[PDB]
Design a protein around this nucleic acid. Structure first.
Ligand SMILES: [Mg+2]
Length: 59
RNA sequence: GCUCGCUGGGGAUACUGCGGGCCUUGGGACCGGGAGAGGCCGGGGGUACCCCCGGGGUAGGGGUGAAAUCCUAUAAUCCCGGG
């Protein structure tokens, strides 16, 4: 039954804000889309703009 | 010699005391550019920690030299969003 519970969940794609490019930053699972609101994701500036210098900047 | 103590007079003016004058070195007052977790009062913050509410997940967590009391299915330890 535990496995069955895990099968009810759908995966949602997370996008960066408009002025940062709006690119895809990841995927998160949930059964009800209302539970996705107010979740937070941490990404480095190197992930958005490719440069091996600003790897220590976290957004 | 001892009772080193008292008293009538004369002389000296280096030091101490007293009176007058004149100083700036000790001390104090004031002005300049700086130093400091010195003190008091008002405002704005930093992580950490404890409790409460909502989501996830499920059988352990904590603690000692070794254990046990203790906490946990009225859902803990752990992770996330708020107060
Ligand atoms: Mg809960």
């Amino acid at each position: 039954a535990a496995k069955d519970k895990w099968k009810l969940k759908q995966w949602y794609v997370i996008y960066a804000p408009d002025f940062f490019g709006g690119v895809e930053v990841g995927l998160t699972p949930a059964d009800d889309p209302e539970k996705v609101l107010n979740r937070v994701v941490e990404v480095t500036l190197k992930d958005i703009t490719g440069d091996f210098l600003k790897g220590h900047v976290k957004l």
